[PDB]
Amino acid sequence: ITLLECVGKGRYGEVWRGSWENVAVKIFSSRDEKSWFRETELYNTVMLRHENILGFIASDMTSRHSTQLWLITHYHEMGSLYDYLQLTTLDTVSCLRIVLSIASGLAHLHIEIFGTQGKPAIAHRDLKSKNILVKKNGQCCIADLGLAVMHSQSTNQLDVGNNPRVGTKRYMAPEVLDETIQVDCFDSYKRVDIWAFGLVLWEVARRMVSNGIVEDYKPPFYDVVPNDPSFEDMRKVVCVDQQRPNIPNRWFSDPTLTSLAKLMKECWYQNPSARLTALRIAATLT
Ligand SMILES: Nc1ncnc2c1ncn2[C@@H]1O[C@H](COP(=O)(O)OP(=O)(O)NP(=O)(O)O)[C@@H](O)[C@H]1O
Ligand SMILES: [Mg+2]
Ligand SMILES: [Mg+2]
Ligand SMILES: [Mg+2]
Ligand SMILES: [Mg+2]
Ligand SMILES: [Mg+2]
Ligand SMILES: [Mg+2]
Ligand SMILES: [Mg+2]
Ligand SMILES: [Mg+2]
């Protein structure tokens, strides 16, 4: 495989555009061996084939001067939803196309499929606009299963891995931050994905035009925490002071943003049990 154009760095590795046609090649720091392992575990055994999930190609360890860990996936030339939202504006058609496709990806991860072509129930745990890619057909796929937890109904076995990495601090649910999440109950990881999905929903809705105007792209809690907030930083905002992103008033002059602020509402309850499910979100968006 021919590494051609690097397209990013990160806190855990780097991503290249290579050929083998075009493929993406994430190259992990060996300080992040556990994420490469976990991701390679899920893709090679769960067989995750779905429109709204980053398709997988292969996984290997090679040369390069030294023993780098490669995860080779479908290349999407339009990149992250995060970079996409800072470049472009959305209308009604492209914005619903995007939040629905994310919702169906998260739902398909969250439900256990039984049968030959089945899968366990999977919770993402680091969902964010940088971990969603936009592909050249309107849909988006979810990526980075490095922290994924799995649950199999047949055994009631919860499988959380041994990755010491924690999710992106900005998108953490309050139960994660105050450290009262039930670690034994798989559903609480599903409710962590929903909280972050609500944040992503706010990110996307801002960039949808209505009555001729938009908001600039901003990351969640942009107005109250610094770039790269730390653990204690987000704790003050989400748990103690109980802050949520603000709804622009111009959403109440459009019926779509009306019912998009409807959803975010019901992913943001601090009590995680009250939060919507990805199936319910995906149902509502249809
Ligand atoms: N399959 C892919 N196709 C195209 N671009 C991709 C792909 N996977 C990742 N990227 C982009 O490559 C860049 C490198 O990012 P990456 O190292 O994967 O994580 P990140 O963007 O830094 N987010 P984070 O892991 O939270 O730090 C980002 O701009 C990604 O959007
Ligand atoms: Mg980067
Ligand atoms: Mg399977
Ligand atoms: Mg990533
Ligand atoms: Mg990514
Ligand atoms: Mg991935
Ligand atoms: Mg990873
Ligand atoms: Mg493991
Ligand atoms: Mg900020």
Residue numbers in the entry: 208 to 227, 230 to 274, 276 to 496
Please quote the authors directly.
Upon ligand binding, bone morphogenetic protein (BMP) receptors form active tetrameric complexes, comprised of two type I and two type II receptors, which then transmit signals to SMAD proteins. Here, using hydrogen deuterium exchange mass spectrometry (HDX-MS), small angle X-ray scattering (SAXS) and molecular dynamics (MD) simulations, combined with analysis of SMAD signaling, we show that the kinase domain of the type I receptor ALK2 and type II receptor BMPR2 form a heterodimeric complex via their C-terminal lobes. Formation of this dimer is essential for ligand-induced receptor signaling and is targeted by mutations in BMPR2 in patients with pulmonary arterial hypertension (PAH). We further show that the type I/type II kinase domain heterodimer serves as the scaffold for assembly of the active tetrameric receptor complexes to enable phosphorylation of the GS domain and activation of SMADs.
In one ALK2KD mutant (ALK2KD-KK), two lysines within helix I (K492 and K493) were mutated to alanines; in another (ALK2KD-RRK), R490 in helix I, along with R485 and K497 on adjacent loops, were mutated to glutamates. Both ALK2KD mutants had greatly impaired ability to dimerize with wild-type BMPR2KD. In particular, ALK2KD-KK completely lost the ability to dimerize. The amphipathic helix I is almost completely composed of basic residues on one side, such as K492, K493, and R490, and together with the αH-αI linker lies at the center of the large basic patch within the ALK2 kinase C-lobe. The ALK2KD double mutant (ALK2-KK) displayed a dominant effect on the BMP4-induced transcription, almost completely eliminating the basal reporter activity. We also obtained crystal structures of the ALK2KD-KK in the presence of AMPPNP and the ALK2 kinase inhibitor, LDN-193189. These structures of the ALK2 kinase domain with an ATP analog demonstrate that K493A mutation or K492A/K493A double mutant do not alter the ALK2 kinase domain structure when compared to wild-type ALK2. Hence, the disruptive effect of these mutations on BMP4-induced ALK2/BMPR2 signaling underscores a functional role of the C-lobe-mediated ALK2/BMPR2 heterodimer in the formation of an active receptor complex.
